[PDB]
RNA sequence: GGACCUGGCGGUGCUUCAUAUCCCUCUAGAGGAGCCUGUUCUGUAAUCGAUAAACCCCGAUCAACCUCACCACCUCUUGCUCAGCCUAUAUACCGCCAUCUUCAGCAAACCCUGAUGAAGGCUACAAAGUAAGCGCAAGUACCCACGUAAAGACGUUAGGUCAAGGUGUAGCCCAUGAGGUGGCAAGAAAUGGGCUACAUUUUCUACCCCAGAAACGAUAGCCCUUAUGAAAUAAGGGUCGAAGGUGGAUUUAG
């Protein structure tokens, strides 16, 4: 790290920068603030979840390619949802939702798991044990599951926006391989119920 | 010591010669002039400033030799001689007595500084006990002799003020008011000029920002300070940039606008924007490859 | 371990000067150079024969001033004035010093084809910077 | 090549390989003999060259000086033998080193007694050789003391030992400056030392270490038999314990309140008063305890009655 | 043989930690294909040295001849040298380094304890420790006090080189030294490390990131030309259209 430990994090929030924590404000104006990264912005079109998902789709430092793929992706998501709205009826138009950000968030929240499987070595054979997962770990697991299913190589000539849009719509409507593998994780935890006493923490 | 005496005499005669040597037959030749003169006379070229030539008086050159603690009859002078730490233990005795008579009436020095003042080697726990004793005296309501005692043991703080240096607003060109700032990030130099009004107009290297920056990430990077300070469509920047890549150039340009909009914004908002982290250079630069490796920190194969 | 120009610590009785006391990583952080020739600077052609003449002169001086040069020489080279500065002890006879001074003077003059100047400095004993 | 030549310090370092000889040369000598005025001969101002006979005579003189220097390397130095050759037990180190407080120890003789090569085990090096020595320092007037010196060098161990001994001296009372006052039986740990006062001319018929210690003290006429473990370091310590815990004639007279008298067979029935009480004289006589309860020694009784048949006891040995 | 001291070990206990090093974790690879380059083995009349961590694009920041010390054949005798030898000995060495070290110890000189043994020397509301010196640290270089460099003592592994050179010991001088000419560097095979891929975030073209079009992969083989050289290895073009379907156990690096 090129920063000394006295350099602290910069925070960017207009609701915090418009006005208890008065001594917090004084200590913050007396301490050293490090520079802001390129990915974060003061804008409010942005989503931290979306930015992290781009950074995970990134390969080789091609942020332009990762961004362009997500560009085409929820572009296609919005297009197909508008097609559903135009081809729908009155009540179907009333119930359908076409905001790609909300669809992305709800797909991830439906995709995230609630329990996890950790290997623990009792005796000489490994036992997969259920474990409570932290929220950061389960969100990372959901996003990595979606990316691996997109890059499963079984899609042949399909393009990445098409893959991710199709899997995203399935995940929002609570189908697809990502929901299937979350259910399979819960299935295997159900298989090994009673090993949960092997945890020491 | 006679060594110190004849060295002081030699230093006086030598500095007299040295002032006569350079230009300064007047008696008043000061220490910084002595250093400048010897620097010219013997051009150092050595990276260590203590390995550079020096002309000081033998008090500063030679260390502090402690005087003889006993005369020509034995009979050492201080009553706490046989402790071997007479100055430290006499100080402890005096502070303890001052606490005792105070009770019957009713930043800090570092260990090396106390060692310099006592001319005695000291332990960390001894220094800690001394500091706790003086803290007890400070917490006790004490008189003025006690206060000046604490203050001759206490030293300065040398606090730093961290308000962002506001560049002046130069009223120039035809009739317009501007500030010219600079920015640097990852071998890219960007100097920018912002005029107060113009409703938002960017002139990177003579062309516009949608031409020099086809990437929406770079355009967002340009937006960032104006969107933080809520003065988006109000100003105009003309900037010239050398070196780097697209993101390094965008970051350097951004630092330049932040460090000129500091002049064009109020002081509370510029402290807020410094807290947001726009007025500090990003020191993260490319590291070096090393012999026997495969990159900056990446190594080769099997080692274990 | 690095064994380049570092004299080791025996037990505390080894007289040693600044030069061979200091290690090669202090080469101009603390020490400086014993030979000042402009050959090793970025634009120059003749630095190789500068260096072979340097080692020739150092071994020649060590061999023709036998057991009196305290520590190593100061070989400076400015223009065509080659300067050999010596730190020689005070144990032989001054006619012998002047004899060898003239001898080395004009031998190096006719060998290197330049004005060569011997500048001597006499010291009583080998100086000690620390004891190792 | 002259360029690949290298200095003799490096050459002898590499040749001797101790880390795991040009003084016989004047400054202007060469085999051709082009002798100059600045070198060799002093500064008539005439350059010349000597003849073949002078050159060969000079080099013959130089060579015979070289074999003379070789001989003055290889003489034989005479080391006095201590208890045997190639040993250390009677080797006389010099007088103790003069103290830093203006102190001289010039009448004090130091004798080594035991040199042991003592090893301990260390994590990195392995076996670590440390020489432990034991010396005794004394002047022939009663003052003596022993000490141990431990170092990595034998000379350092010697110096440490003799200086620590002169800081740890004793005093030994002597009867007539030739012998002890009585017979001393003393067991120190596992070393039983039985010593007897002997008359004049008996000599030092004692263990060789006891002979050296008593020569440093001043005692001349004692018998001493050691038994149990003949450990050198316990021998010296038990000997010094007994010799410092002697009870003298004056102390005996003061303790009992009676006259101390001597009856020699050489003089006859003449009683010789040796020590009188310094205070009052006790008037009731000493109680004659018939058949006294004392602990006798079977070796003494065996020698007195003559069943001690040994081929080693009264052998004809050298002086003291 | 009995009892110890010190050290190393313990599939040795308790407690606290490690964080790219210890596990769960995070990313990208190796091991699977081809090619390049070392090594083992085979082969040849054909060098030598490195070879658990600390060998394996290592001496070489590099072998057509030269280099070269190898082999074959033929020549030279005070041989460029008051000769030389690349002859053996890295278990005689200097020299310059690896490893612990991604450590903090090593310690001259003293003093004390142990009935004056090997040894040991800890309690700040303090029970015998004091310390010159080396090292860490500190001070320097790069862009900051951060980070990266450099630096890291004593010793360990008789750790690597007598072949960089010098060199002690033993040997040669019709030789084991010197010179000339010509060859030696080939794979039934195996292995270490790199490079390129097995494509769709891909490929070709323009642009150097707002298009068009596909819907793959040899820096290998053969041919032509060129560069340099006395004498081709390298470069370009032509030709060809391999195996290959993201690789098990294990493992590397951050
Ligand atoms: C056979 N041993 C007793 C031995 C002997 C010598 N030297 C001699 O005794 C020869 N002395 C003469 C030739 C007569 C002058 C030796 O010189 C050696 C060694 C051991 C070797 C072992 C080497 C080995 N490597 C080369 C395969 C090895 O694996 C290690 C290791 N720990 O990794 C070694 O110790 C080793 O490298 C090594 O250094 C050895 C010797 O030096
Ligand atoms: Mg003998
Ligand atoms: Mg070998
Ligand atoms: Mg040969
Ligand atoms: Mg190393
Ligand atoms: Mg390093
Ligand atoms: Mg350091
Ligand atoms: Mg070995």
Full 3-state SS string of chain D? CCCCCCCHHHHHHHHHCCCCCCCCCCCCCCCCCCCCCCCCCCCCCCCCCCCHHHHHHHHHHHHHHHHHHHHCCCCCCCCCCCCCCCCCCCCEECCCCCECCCECCCCCEEEEEEEEEEEEEECCCEEEEEEEEEEEEECCCCCEEEEEEEECCHHHHHHHHHHHHHHCCCCCCCCCCCCCCCEEEEEECCEEEEEEECCCCCCEECCHHHHHHHHHHCCCCEEEEEEECCCHHHHHHHHHHHHHCCCCHHHHHHHHCCCEEECCCCCCCCCEEEECCCCCCCCCCCCCCCCCCCCCCHHHHHHHHCCCCCCCCCCCCCCC
Taking each helix axis from N to C end, the angle separating A48-57 and A100-111, rounded to the nearest 10 degrees, works out to 70
Element (H, E) at B150: helix B144-153
Contacts within 8 Å (CB) and 24+ apart, C104-110: C104/C60, C104/C61, C104/C64, C104/C65, C108/C57, C108/C60, C108/C82, C108/C84
Resolution in A: 3.2
Contacts of C29 in chain B (CB under 8 A): 46-48, 51
Å from D115 (CA) to E135 (C1')? 35
Task: For residue D241, give both structure tokens.
Answer: 């314990």
Element (H, E) at B130: helix B124-139
CB atoms within 10 A of CB D224: 23
Task: For residue C113, give both structure tokens.
Answer: 């084809």
Q: Experimental method for this entry? A: cryo-EM
- The Cα D134–Cα A83 span in angstroms is 107
- The Cα B260–Cα B167 span in angstroms is 7
Å from B66 (CA) to E119 (C1')? 39
Q: What are A125's strand-pairing partners?
A: A122
D239 within 8 A of D208, measured Cβ to Cβ: no
- Relative to beta strand D222-228, strand D204-205 is parallel
CB atoms within 10 A of CB B72: 6
- The Cα A19–Cα D83 span in angstroms is 101
- The Cα A31–Cα C93 span in angstroms is 72
Residue in B with minimal Cα distance to C18: B51
Per DSSP, which regions of B44-156 are E strands? 70-71, 74-76
- The Cα A138–Cα A135 span in angstroms is 5
B132 within 8 A of B96, measured Cβ to Cβ: no
Chains D and C touch (3+ CB pairs under 8 A): yes
Contacts of B271 in chain A (CB under 8 A): 29
- The Cα B39–Cα A139 span in angstroms is 65
- The Cα D177–Cα C71 span in angstroms is 63
Element (H, E) at B193: strand B189-195
B256 φ, ψ (degrees, to nearest 5): -65, -45
A169 within 8 A of A77, measured Cβ to Cβ: yes
Protein-proximal positions, strand E, CB < 7 A? 5-8, 24-28, 53-54, 92-100, 102, 107-112, 114-120, 124-126, 131-134, 139-141, 143-157, 165-168, 192-194, 200-202, 209-210, 215, 246, 251-254
Neighbours of chain D (3+ CB pairs under 8 A): C
- The Cα A41–Cα A47 span in angstroms is 10
């Amino acid at each position: 790290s090129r920063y000394s430990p006295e350099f602290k994090d910069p925070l960017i929030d207009k609701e915090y920068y418009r006005k208890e924590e008065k001594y917090v404000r004084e200590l913050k104006k007396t301490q050293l603030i490090k520079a802001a990264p390129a990915g974060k912005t003061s804008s409010v079109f942005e989503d931290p979840v979306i930015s992290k998902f781009t950074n995970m789709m990134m390969i080789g430092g091609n942020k332009v390619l990762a961004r362009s793929l997500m560009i085409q992706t929820l572009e296609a998501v919005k297009r197909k949802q508008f097609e559903k709205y135009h081809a729908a009826s009155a009540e179907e138009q009333a119930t359908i939702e076409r905001n790609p950000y909300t669809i992305f968030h709800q797909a991830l929240k439906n995709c995230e798991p609630m329990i996890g499987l950790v290997p623990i070595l009792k005796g000489g054979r490994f036992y997969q044990v259920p474990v409570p997962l932290p929220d950061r770990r389960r969100r990372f697991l959901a996003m990595k599951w979606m990316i691996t299913e997109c890059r499963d190589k079984k899609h042949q000539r399909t393009l990445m926006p098409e893959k991710l849009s199709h899997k995203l719509l399935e995940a929002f409507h609570n189908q697809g391989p990502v929901i299937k593998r979350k259910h399979d994780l819960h299935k295997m935890a159900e298989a090994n119920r009673a090993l949960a006493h092997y945890r020491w923490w | 010591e006679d060594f110190i005496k004849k060295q002081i005499e030699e230093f006086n005669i030598g500095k007299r010669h040295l002032a006569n040597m350079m230009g300064e037959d007047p008696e008043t030749f000061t220490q910084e002039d002595i250093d400048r003169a010897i620097a010219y006379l013997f051009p150092s070229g050595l990276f260590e400033k203590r390995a550079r030539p020096v002309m000081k008086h033998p008090e500063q050159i030679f260390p502090r030799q402690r005087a003889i603690q006993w005369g020509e009859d034995g009979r050492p002078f201080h009553y706490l001689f046989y402790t071997g730490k007479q100055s430290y233990y006499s100080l402890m005795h005096d502070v303890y007595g001052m606490l005792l008579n105070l009770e019957k009436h009713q930043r800090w020095l570092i260990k090396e500084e106390l060692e310099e003042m006592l001319v005695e080697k000291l332990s960390d726990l001894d220094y800690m006990q001394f500091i706790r004793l003086l803290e007890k005296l400070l917490t006790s309501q004490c008189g003025a002799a006690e206060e000046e005692f604490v203050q001759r043991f206490r030293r300065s703080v040398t606090l730093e003020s961290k308000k962002q240096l506001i560049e002046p607003v130069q009223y120039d060109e035809q009739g317009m008011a501007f500030s010219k700032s600079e920015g640097k990030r990852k071998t890219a130099k960007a100097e920018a000029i912002v005029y107060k009004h113009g409703s938002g107009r960017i002139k990177v290297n003579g062309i516009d920002y949608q031409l020099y920056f086809p990437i929406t990430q770079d355009r967002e990077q340009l937006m960032f300070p104006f969107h933080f300070v809520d003065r988006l469509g109000k100003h105009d920047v003309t900037c010239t940039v050398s070196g780097g890549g697209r993101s390094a150039q965008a970051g350097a340009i951004r630092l330049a606008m932040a460090k000129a909009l500091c002049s064009f914004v109020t002081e509370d908002e510029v402290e807020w924007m410094r807290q947001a982290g726009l007025l500090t250079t990003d020191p993260r630069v490319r590291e070096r490859k090393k012999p026997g490796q495969e990159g900056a920190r990446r190594k080769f194969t099997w080692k274990k | 371990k690095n064994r380049a120009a570092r004299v080791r610590v025996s037990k505390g009785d080894k007289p040693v000067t600044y030069e061979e006391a200091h290690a090669p990583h202090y080469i101009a952080h603390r020490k400086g150079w014993l030979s000042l020739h402009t050959g090793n600077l970025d634009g120059e052609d003749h630095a190789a024969e500068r260096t072979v003449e340097d080692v020739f002169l150092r071994k020649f001086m060590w061999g023709t001033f036998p057991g009196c040069l305290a520590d190593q020489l100061v070989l400076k080279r400015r223009g065509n004035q080659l300067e050999i500065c010596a730190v020689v002890l005070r144990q032989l006879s001054p006619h012998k010093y002047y004899f060898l001074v003239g001898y080395s003077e004009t031998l190096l003059s006719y060998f290197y084809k330049c004005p060569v100047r011997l500048h001597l400095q006499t010291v009583p004993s080998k100086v000690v910077y620390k004891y190792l | 090549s002259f360029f690949t030549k290298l200095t003799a310090d490096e050459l002898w370092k590499g040749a001797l390989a101790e880390t795991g000889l040009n003084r016989g040369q004047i400054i202007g000598e060469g085999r051709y003999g082009f002798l100059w005025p600045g070198l060799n001969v002093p500064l008539v101002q005439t350059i010349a060259q000597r003849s073949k006979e002078e050159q060969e005579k000079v080099e013959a003189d130089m060579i015979q000086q070289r074999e003379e220097w070789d001989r003055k390397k290889k003489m034989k130095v005479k080391r006095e033998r201590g208890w045997s050759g190639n040993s250390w037990g009677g080797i006389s180190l010099g007088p103790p080193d003069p103290g830093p407080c203006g102190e001289t120890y010039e009448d004090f003789d130091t004798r080594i007694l035991e040199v042991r090569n003592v090893f301990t085990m260390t994590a990195k090096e392995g076996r670590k050789k440390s020489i432990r020595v034991l010396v005794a320092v004394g002047n022939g007037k009663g003052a003596a003391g022993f000490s141990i010196g431990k170092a990595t060098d034998r000379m350092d161990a010697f110096r440490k030992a003799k200086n620590r001994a002169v800081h740890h001296l004793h005093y030994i009372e002597r009867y007539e400056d030739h012998t002890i006052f009585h017979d001393i039986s003393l067991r120190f740990k596992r070393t039983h030392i039985k010593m007897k006062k002997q008359p004049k001319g008996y000599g030092l018929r004692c263990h060789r270490a006891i002979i050296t210690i008593c020569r440093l003290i001043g005692i001349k006429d004692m018998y001493a038999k050691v038994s149990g473990s003949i450990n050198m370091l316990s021998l010296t310590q038990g000997l010094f314990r007994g010799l410092s815990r002697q009870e003298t004639h004056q102390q005996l007279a003061d303790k009992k309140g009676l006259h101390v008298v001597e009856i020699r067979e050489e003089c006859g029935p003449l009683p010789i008063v040796v020590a009188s009480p310094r205070g009052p004289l006790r008037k009731d006589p000493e109680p004659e305890d018939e058949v006294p309860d004392v602990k006798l020694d079977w070796e003494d009784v065996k020698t007195a009655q003559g069943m001690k048949r040994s081929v080693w006891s009264n052998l004809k040995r050298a002086a003291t």
